Amino acid sequence: APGGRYYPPALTGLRGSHPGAFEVAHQMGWEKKTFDVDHLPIEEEYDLVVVGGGISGLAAAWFYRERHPAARILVIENHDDFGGHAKRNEFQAGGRTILGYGGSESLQSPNALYSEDAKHLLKRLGVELKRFETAFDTDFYPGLGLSRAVFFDKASFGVDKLVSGDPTPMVADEVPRDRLNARSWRAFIGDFPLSREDREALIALYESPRDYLAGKSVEEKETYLAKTSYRDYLLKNVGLSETSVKYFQGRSNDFSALGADALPAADAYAAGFPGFDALGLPQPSEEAQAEMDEPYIYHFPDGNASLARLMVRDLIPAVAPGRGMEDIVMARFDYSKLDLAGHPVRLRLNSTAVSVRNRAGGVDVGYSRAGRLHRVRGKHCVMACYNMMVPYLLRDLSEEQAHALSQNVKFPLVYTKVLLRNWQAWKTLGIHEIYAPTLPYSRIKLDFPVDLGSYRHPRDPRQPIGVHMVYVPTTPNAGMDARTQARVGRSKLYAMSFEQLEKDIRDQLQAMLGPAGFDHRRDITGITVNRWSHGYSYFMNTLYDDEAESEALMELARSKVGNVAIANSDAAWDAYAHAAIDQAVRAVREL
Ligand SMILES: Cc1cc2nc3c(=O)[nH]c(=O)nc-3n(C[C@H](O)[C@H](O)[C@H](O)COP(=O)(O)OP(=O)(O)OC[C@H]3O[C@@H](n4cnc5c(N)ncnc54)[C@H](O)[C@@H]3O)c2cc1C
Ligand code: HEM
């Protein structure tokens, strides 16, 4: 968008891993081109060079500077904005800003899951978690009488049908259970477009649970459920029909990046799926219960992009005024201040690192920016990029360590923001969120209502609002393992133009909201598609992976290489912001 201030959050259209962000990376990864910089002069010298400008890389710079207050630090990032998966999206509607989150969504169970170091970072940045108990408008949608709904599609169920009053409790649920505005299981499932037989079988799944593994010991049941997909468990042990289990296919797409065919039944049990109540399995532990019980309210209006923005402002005060969690939300960021010469911390966007080599007690780093190669030097280096990227960069890796890094196959996801002129159609249909079992977008919702800083969430159904929807390009029921579904999902996204992505959005919104007078051409006033082709870190999947071999690969992959330490959430095989922070802390301590 030339002619305006350099300001990525205001961009709409094809975002996430946008055109321009990945082309050099694919020249290495797909064509095996090597970009050597050993014959170029060193242009700049730092104490620390960080490859990758997501939460992990920014946390690496932050904890390094805490240990080394005078440190000169360069962060090299290939997207056009900092933050990695944590991106701020903006819309202009009716003279005001509407904020959305491009990716990394909320702080997950922070009281239970965030380490003392991560809590220390939040404290120093001015984030008081208790503020979200009032910032998050928990009773807003429930108090309007709205509920969650399931949209059955004609292609999979014979008819389009929206069924509201869903009582399903979700893993990370922002709605109190007594505020779901839901119906009984019998009344809810009674409206499903399924045969009477299938409807009775689903209702009995809730009303009359049975020990589908009768005879087995608890240990044998746990082993079986770790090795059996949720879908197969429902088919073979519960006995639901192939059409019945379709209702469950996409429910796990968002939180696991795969469908029920690739979800271990044991993981479905931990996530609160039905069918386990009479198996006699142990109740979840203290940690599992304290984590599951925390309200899912720790949501800045732009998601975890606020964490990245807080860190950038703390590292480079010239970029934006202010301090603390309230004024960050509408703070104005000046991107021309990110990379100023002589300044101790510099964040260099649109730059793909291509080479990392230990030399003479320091680290030489090559990168490509605007098609030209550059060479810089640090005493230390943190690889905070995608771990499968590291073997193409770090020239000092053993064959074994390079292979281990390559086994972290990340999952693709698409987080789409849609600006609507109004949300009367949602009010008329009595809904604030829709689950679609088989369609591309499995989750479609009015955005979380959060008031923070000077930002107020949209309130008036006659006025504009942001919608969030999740599309995961799974290939269900094909016999693929998880790594293959992930790679194939990326191939599917690579083949799709923005025009094809927009058609899927407009088609599905029109089919679901149209009966209430929605007109996609008239009522959609903005679309931002955050394409996270390399989204969640891989995670150990008991359907396909051996735990002992997987933990060994993970630990080998993140082994320090001279003065080069390895971070990113990938290094934990754990797709969370607190893992991104903790892996950076480990890497900084190693140096
Ligand atoms: C759609 C989505 C939703 C999520 N929601 C949540 C949530 O609610 N809660 C939660 O805790 N976590 C969530 N996450 C997990 C998320 O991965 C982490 O929260 C965190 O954002 C990851 O930070 P990171 O630094 O580990 O990785 P990233 O954010 O991916 O940062 C790595 C960066 O390195 C860059 N890079 C790669 N190669 C190079 C190179 N050669 N040179 C330079 N830079 C390079 C990448 O382009 C990227 O920008 C979500 C993730 C996704 C994809
Ligand atoms: C910051 C953005 C990106 C980076 C750094 C990046 C980097 C890479 C690398 C290094 C590989 C090789 C993996 C290996 O050999 O182990 C790869 C694979 C691949 N990428 Fe990307 N890529 C990016 C964005 C994208 C986008 C936007 C798409 C599609 C729209 C895409 C599609 C694919 C596909 C299909 C593969 C092959 C399957 C796989 O091995 O995962 N990538 N990417």
Side-chain angles (χ1 to χ4, degrees):
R5 189 170 55 111
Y6 191 102
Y7 194 68
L11 303 174
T12 63
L14 182 58
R15 301 298 296 150
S17 291
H18 53 82
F22 57 89
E23 284 80 352
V24 176
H26 280 180
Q27 287 183 290
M28 293 182 279
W30 294 13
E31 308 174 48
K32 305 290 190 252
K33 289 179 183 158
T34 65
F35 301 92
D36 276 340
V37 304
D38 307 321
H39 302 150
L40 306 174
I42 285 123
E43 298 157 41
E44 299 164 15
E45 301 229 346
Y46 299 87
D47 298 301
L48 171 73
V49 181
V50 180
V51 175
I55 284 168
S56 195
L58 296 168
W62 194 96
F63 279 93
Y64 193 93
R65 185 187 63 175
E66 194 183 48
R67 169 66 189 92
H68 302 297
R72 303 159 300 171
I73 301 167
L74 174 72
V75 182
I76 305 171
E77 163 63 25
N78 63 314
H79 288 88
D80 66 17
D81 195 5
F82 55 80
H85 296 141
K87 292 284 163 48
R88 173 187 180 99
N89 303 145
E90 298 178 6
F91 290 121
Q92 296 299 313
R96 62 158 285 171
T97 302
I98 293 182
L99 291 179
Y101 54 99
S104 193
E105 178 177 73
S106 299
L107 300 325
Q108 179 72 69
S109 302
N111 304 286
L113 294 183
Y114 275 51
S115 67
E116 284 311 299
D117 284 295
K119 286 179 178 157
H120 170 65
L121 173 63
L122 289 181
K123 172 192 61 204
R124 300 297 297 154
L125 296 172
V127 177
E128 172 48 69
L129 290 175
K130 295 184 180 63
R131 170 61 173 122
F132 287 103
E133 293 175 40
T134 52
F136 200 102
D137 204 353
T138 298
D139 200 58
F140 184 63
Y141 295 139
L144 291 174
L146 308 179
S147 65
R148 299 201 278 239
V150 180
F151 182 75
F152 302 85
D153 58 291
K154 192 197 313 159
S156 283
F157 301 92
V159 62
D160 283 353
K161 198 181 193 189
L162 185 69
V163 182
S164 71
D166 187 356
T168 300
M170 285 177 0
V171 207
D173 206 333
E174 74 278 27
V175 187
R177 200 94 67 84
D178 54 353
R179 298 270 49 217
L180 285 177
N181 287 329
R183 300 187 277 155
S184 72
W185 287 114
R186 180 168 293 279
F188 180 60
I189 300 167
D191 291 336
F192 283 11
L194 293 180
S195 71
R196 180 193 241 267
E197 192 183 293
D198 281 350
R199 259 157 32 221
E200 303 277 4
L202 282 174
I203 289 166
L205 184 64
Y206 285 97
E207 286 183 356
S208 295
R210 302 185 307 253
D211 190 357
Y212 312 109
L213 307 179
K216 296 190 196 296
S217 63
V218 176
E219 177 177 43
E220 290 170 332
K221 288 172 173 174
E222 291 188 335
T223 297
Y224 179 79
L225 293 169
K227 296 257 63 170
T228 309
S229 71
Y230 187 52
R231 178 166 187 278
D232 282 344
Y233 174 71
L234 296 179
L235 287 176
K236 303 188 182 174
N237 305 104
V238 183
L240 303 180
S241 74
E242 325 79 64
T243 306
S244 280
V245 300
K246 280 186 198 169
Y247 162 68
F248 296 97
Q249 178 180 111
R251 186 75 83 166
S252 62
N253 284 4
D254 188 23
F255 82 84
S256 78
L258 312 132
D261 62 305
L263 178 69
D267 294 359
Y269 167 61
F273 282 77
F276 303 97
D277 289 342
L279 296 184
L281 297 174
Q283 209 51 225
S285 57
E286 309 152 29
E287 188 285 305
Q289 198 65 67
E291 168 190 349
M292 285 164 17
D293 287 349
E294 262 181 76
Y296 194 67
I297 61 171
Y298 301 97
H299 184 73
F300 296 88
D302 54 6
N304 296 337
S306 276
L307 294 188
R309 282 159 59 85
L310 285 159
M311 277 188 286
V312 166
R313 186 176 64 177
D314 198 56
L315 284 163
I316 312 173
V319 67
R323 169 163 266 89
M325 74 185 299
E326 305 278 340
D327 61 16
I328 196 68
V329 181
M330 290 297 295
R332 164 197 191 77
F333 270 55
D334 179 359
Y335 279 69
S336 74
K337 300 290 180 281
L338 284 177
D339 190 14
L340 289 180
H343 273 236
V345 185
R346 304 175 64 174
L347 205 179
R348 185 160 300 159
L349 298 170
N350 308 292
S351 299
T352 303
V354 296
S355 181
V356 178
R357 204 185 299 268
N358 282 278
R359 183 183 64 79
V363 183
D364 298 341
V365 180
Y367 66 88
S368 175
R369 183 184 61 77
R372 190 72 304 272
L373 292 183
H374 300 261
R375 185 186 188 190
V376 302
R377 182 160 166 84
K379 169 75 172 178
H380 299 128
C381 175
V382 169
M383 311 295 291
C385 56
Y386 306 154
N387 279 9
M388 94 282 163
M389 178 92 261
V390 176
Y392 297 100
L393 272 50
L394 178 51
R395 301 283 196 266
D396 298 327
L397 287 164
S398 71
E399 310 182 25
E400 293 73 23
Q401 191 171 350
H403 171 264
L405 286 153
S406 76
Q407 295 317 111
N408 189 326
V409 178
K410 302 170 66 63
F411 295 96
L413 302 90
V414 176
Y415 271 20
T416 290
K417 323 276 88 174
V418 175
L419 184 66
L420 294 191
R421 254 187 347 126
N422 68 69
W423 43 291
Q424 294 161 203
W426 293 78
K427 283 297 304 287
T428 293
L429 295 171
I431 54 162
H432 66 91
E433 168 161 352
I434 303 174
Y435 163 53
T438 64
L439 288 179
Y441 286 88
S442 63
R443 178 175 206 203
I444 312 91
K445 61 191 291 307
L446 305 174
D447 205 0
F448 302 117
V450 177
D451 301 308
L452 191 60
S454 68
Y455 184 84
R456 305 255 303 170
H457 68 81
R459 279 161 161 82
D460 183 352
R462 299 166 308 186
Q463 294 295 309
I465 194 166
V467 166
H468 162 77
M469 47 204 299
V470 183
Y471 156 51
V472 186
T474 60
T475 309
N477 314 325
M480 302 176 187
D481 61 17
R483 286 188 174 81
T484 299
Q485 282 207 57
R487 296 184 189 107
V488 169
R490 257 187 294 287
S491 301
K492 293 206 276 175
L493 291 178
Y494 190 72
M496 297 174 75
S497 65
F498 183 77
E499 292 68 28
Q500 293 167 306
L501 293 161
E502 172 170 3
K503 184 177 178 289
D504 279 357
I505 296 160
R506 292 184 174 273
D507 285 353
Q508 194 170 336
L509 286 179
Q510 189 60 42
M512 304 186 301
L513 305 176
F518 187 84
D519 174 354
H520 72 90
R521 189 50 61 184
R522 173 195 68 204
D523 295 335
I524 296 177
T525 48
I527 299 168
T528 302
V529 179
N530 298 271
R531 176 182 64 186
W532 300 117
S533 299
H534 301 272
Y536 300 162
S537 167
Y538 190 73
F539 62 92
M540 202 279 293
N541 188 318
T542 53
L543 299 182
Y544 316 113
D545 300 315
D546 180 71
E547 176 172 25
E549 293 181 8
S550 292
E551 175 169 52
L553 282 167
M554 183 185 64
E555 286 180 35
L556 170 60
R558 67 190 185 201
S559 305
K560 186 168 75 110
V561 180
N563 280 3
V564 181
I566 296 186
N568 202 273
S569 55
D570 280 356
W573 288 30
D574 198 19
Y576 284 109
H578 55 272
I581 290 165
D582 284 341
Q583 292 309 302
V585 174
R586 169 185 55 70
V588 163
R589 302 296 180 244
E590 291 175 358
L591 294 172

